Structures are given as structure tokens and as C-alpha cells.
Amino acid sequence: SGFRKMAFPSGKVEGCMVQVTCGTTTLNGLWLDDVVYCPRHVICTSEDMLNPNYEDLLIRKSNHNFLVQAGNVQLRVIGHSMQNCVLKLKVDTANPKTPKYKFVRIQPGQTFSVLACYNGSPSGVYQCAMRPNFTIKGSFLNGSCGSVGFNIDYDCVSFCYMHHMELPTGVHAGTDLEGNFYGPFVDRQTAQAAGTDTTITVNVLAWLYAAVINGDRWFLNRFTTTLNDFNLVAMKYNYEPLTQDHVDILGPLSAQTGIAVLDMCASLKELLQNGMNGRTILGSALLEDEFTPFDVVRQCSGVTF
Amino acid sequence: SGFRKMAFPSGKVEGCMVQVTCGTTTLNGLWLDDVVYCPRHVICTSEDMLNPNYEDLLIRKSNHNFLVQAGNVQLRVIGHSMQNCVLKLKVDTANPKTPKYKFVRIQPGQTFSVLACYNGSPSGVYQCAMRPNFTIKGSFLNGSCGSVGFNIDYDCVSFCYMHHMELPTGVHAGTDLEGNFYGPFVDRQTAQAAGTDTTITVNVLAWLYAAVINGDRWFLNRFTTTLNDFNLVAMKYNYEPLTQDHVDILGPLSAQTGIAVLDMCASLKELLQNGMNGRTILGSALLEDEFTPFDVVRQCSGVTF
Ligand SMILES: O=C(CN1Cc2ccc(Cl)cc2[C@H](C(=O)Nc2cncc3ccccc23)C1)Nc1cccc(N2CCOCC2)c1
Ligand SMILES: O=C(CN1Cc2ccc(Cl)cc2[C@H](C(=O)Nc2cncc3ccccc23)C1)Nc1cccc(N2CCOCC2)c1
């Protein structure tokens, strides 16, 4: 019993964290096999950041201008290339701690663990979600650039995010491990803003199924809804539209608890209307949207209470 | 910016997790130097759980009855002894991954990271607090026994908790690494219940300082209070009494934000009497009490390990 915002164990990623330095800038890198991946903005000065020409800045660099430190060991850079907004530094030593891994690009609503790092040294681990507006609500200070997001389903590490910047509202933007930004963001100090964010409807539904599995049914009702009537109500509370894909994804949890997806949708509609009336669901007074259907099945018991 | 429930990086503890099997029971063990530590109830059958005489059950056992697996490697048990509710299995191989460590007993209100494990394999990491009633609101399924709690101080792992049981309300009970229970619990199948819990006042105050640091100030007011008047109000809402030690501990955060501790206490008093009025603090509609003053300072300064 219980339900916590749970992160994957971070050890396999801690053994990959390194510090990358170019002139006066220092940030984090990810060392996998003989390559160190880091944000390309490590080659920038604070002045360069308004309209940097990364191709022009990089062409002026040699291998020996990049200092890479792994623990108290200096690694030797023997090659460098840019792939989208990521710099790939070839090094003369393969990481003996390289886990089994993949690079995966995730979609909004997906969750992952973040290993926040400073100067190549891990400081903390937390769980988060790719918001519908492609930002992440992280906890990052200056020097955290290059910290990564990942999942570890079945001993293989799937890297999905590399941290690049903090937007004016305090939220964060980054790229996949191939350097493609999530969202309409660019790695420069031009005026950019997070779009209006919405609630991840399929995740709130998954979390309501987690509450039922853990024994809580107070929020259920005798009603059902059509998918279109549900979406008309949900859009009025800034909730993402629920698609037939989301309904199919919730199938296993519907079968486990005996509550049809559109029946749980009717419960969500009522909760949006009435609020919680001094009650909580899984220790929360708000409707939680950073647990996916897959996270609920991974964490919860296979036997409903 | 940002504030998340953050755990310590778990790698140094992952390298210590092993599987302990005796009879039909399989649980987790902690391998440090040449000893594997695990709950002494691993020697019990379901029948033995009502009134176990653990010395009498342990006498029947020989070293070869305990099967210890470290990954896909069998460890050889060469001795066994009991210390309070913890079984210590001497093995013929020192853990080459043993970190610098200490066994520490924590007090209620203190937080720690839990590395939840099944079959000696780490599955997740989360942050939690030792409740004033000596339970932890964890997330544990059957097979999680032997999972440990810890903090990291510089490079030293301080182990503070080993998981033993789940109470009828879904909360959890365990021991320090010397086998002493936190709370009035016993390792046997008998009628046991968590006592009435209270809110950790000093931690709510620390979290209100974290909210101010992150830009949220709607709850601040021009008023102050005495420690005496604050405790009279706090006891009315089942909040733990605030002592001069807690006030001294909040000194750094008071100086950083310019809000005296008794000024923040006046804010907390108004929140208890009026509620939040549709507003949230750090994304929460409840007053969060699982961040200590040290956790707030650490997260708002990027300390690494
Ligand atoms: O001033 C900068 C400089 N950055 C420009 C810039 C532009 C484009 C790209 Cl791709 C990267 C970056 C870097 C950047 O965002 N770095 C950071 C990453 N994650 C968290 C951070 C938390 C604080 C600071 C930096 C962070 C560097 N940024 C900044 C963004 C948002 C708020 C603030 N603060 C309000 C004023 O007090 C001080 C913190 C300062
Ligand atoms: O079945 C057992 C047996 N335990 C006896 C026992 C006695 C003393 C000691 Cl020191 C340890 C233990 C074990 C124990 O607590 N293990 C567990 C630890 N963490 C999470 C768990 C999650 C599920 C199950 C076990 C868990 C094993 N307990 C149990 C725990 C919680 C609810 C219930 N309920 C039954 C009645 O229906 C409604 C659920 C039954």
C-alpha cells in the first residue's frame, strides 16, 4: 500500500556524469562509451547568447579547448561534432561504467526521473513529466545544464531529456539526446515564453485508478459519459482532450478495478465541478497528473483493495 | 527555480542490495563489508509469525539454509547472529562496492531516502519523513522487506531505516540498522496500529520559506506572534509543538528572506484558521511537512555527492 512520486534508482546514470568546461563556462556532460554529450551552449559566452552562430563559434575550437573531468580524472578529447543543440565530444577512454542504454524521444504526459547535477556531481533525484506545453517543472539552479532525464524499465537506461535552460516563469526547457528541443524553444536568450499549460487528463484518470486500487472510492458516482461530452467539460477546466488512444491505454486499469473508463471520466467530471470538500485522494488535495497509466501499473499492487 | 520532493542519489546503496532467501521467505538484505543485514523475520513461516521465539527458531538454522544472491552470484554464509530485530549473516566475501558508511538512528520529523527493492533488485527511490507517530508513509508491496532508508553527508552514507512491515492503515514500520524499532511496534502478526499522527511544524515553516525563496508570497502578513501563543494554536490543529531549537534552526532561512520565524508563524496561524482560499503554495493545496530546514537549504543551494 501507499503511493509516492517514485524515481528510478539513479546509480546507472551517476556513473555517466562528468563536468565539461570551455573557457569560463562549466556544465554537465553524459559519458557513454567513448562520447561525452552536453548542451552546445557550453561554447557560448553570456554575450553570444542573444544570437549565437554555433557553427561559427565551434569552427574556432579545437579538441584541447574542451576540458572534461570524470571524478578526479581529466579525460582527453580526440574529436568533436555538433548534432542539433547537442555537442558530442569524442574521448580517448570508453566509460567502464556505461550501462545498457537507448536514446528515446518522449511525448507530452510521459514521466521520467531527473538526476540533478552540478560540476559533474549528482546532487538529487526526482520524478517529473513532460508538460503538454513541452516544458518541465523541474528544480534546477545555475550550473545544472547537461543534467539528464531517464527511465529504467528492465535494467536498460532510456535517456529522454538533457537540460538546457530556465524560462521566465521558472519552468525548464531541454532537448532529447539527439539535440532536438522539446517544444518551440531555441538555445538563445531571445524573448521566449512557455505556452498556457494544461492538465494531463489521461494521467489524472490513471491516478484515480491508483486510488481505487489502494482502497479509496469516495469520488465515484452512478453516472457515465460519452467521450465527446467529457472533452467538452474537460476543455473548460484547461484539461487536455482525452482521445480513444488514452481510453485504450486505460483498459488494463479498467479491467482490474471493474470501473469502465467512461465511468471514471464521469467521476473526474464531478470532481472538477465540486472539488474535494475537505477530502484527499492518495494524500493529495489536488488532482495529480504526473503519474502515467504505466507508472500506476508498475507501482501499484496487481490486487485491488 | 523549482522545488521538488528530491531524494539523494541512490547508487552507493544500490551496490549493497542483495536477496536473502530462507525456507519459503525471500526478502532484501544490505551487504556491507563481510556482513549481510536483513529483518530477523526471514527465518519465520506464516505460522511462526503469531508468537515467534527467534532464538529458538534461529538455533535450528545452519549457515547453508540462508541463500544470499548478489546479482547472479551466490554469496557463501559462514556465520549468523541476531542483534535486536536484525539478522546479521557473515559472508565469505567483503562487498567491493561498500561505501563509506555509518548506522544512525533518526528522530521524528527527520527525512531520508528509501530505495525500494524486490528480490535484491532496486526498483525505485523516494523521499519520506519519519512521522511523529514513528511510522513512514511509504510505498511498499510484499517482498519489499529489507529495503533501506538513508541520507548522504558529503561522501558518507548514513543508513537510518530498514523496512519490516505494513500496518492496517497502509503506513509502514521498521527499525534502525541496529534492529531497534522506530515506534511501539513488534515483528509479529498481532493486533498493532499506528497512533494518531501530527504535523511536523518546523518542516511546514521550512517549506513556507522555500515557497518565499521561489517567489510565492501571498500568505505573508504584517503580523507576528509569541512562541507561547503560536503553540496554543498549533496544538489545536494537531501540529507538533515548536521549540526554541526549531526557531534557532530556521535562523538562516529567516535571515535570507527577511521574515522572522515568529512572523512566518503568524502566517502559518492564519493559514490554519482560514485555509488557502483557492490558492496553492509550491503546487500544493495542503501544508507540506516532509521537507526539513536542511533539505530546503540544500535544494536551494545545489549541494553535490
Ligand atoms: O540568467 C540566466 C542565464 N542563462 C541564460 C540561458 C539562455 C539560453 C540557454 Cl539555452 C541557457 C541559458 C542558461 C540557463 O538558463 N541556465 C539555467 C538552467 N536551469 C536553471 C537555471 C536557474 C537559474 C539560472 C540559470 C539556470 C544561462 N538565466 C536565468 C533564467 C531564468 C531565471 C534566472 N534567474 C532570475 C534572476 O535571478 C537569477 C536567476 C536566470
Ligand atoms: O499479509 C500480511 C503478512 N505480513 C505479516 C507481517 C507481520 C509482522 C512483520 Cl514484522 C512483517 C509482516 C509482513 C509485512 O508486513 N510485509 C509487508 C511490508 N510492506 C508492505 C506490504 C504490503 C502487503 C503485504 C505485506 C507487506 C507480512 N500483512 C499485511 C500487510 C498489510 C495489509 C494486510 N491486509 C490483510 C487483510 O486484508 C487487507 C490487507 C496484511
Ligand SMILES: [Cl-]
Ligand atoms: Cl512517450
Ligand code: NA
Ligand atoms: Na507575518
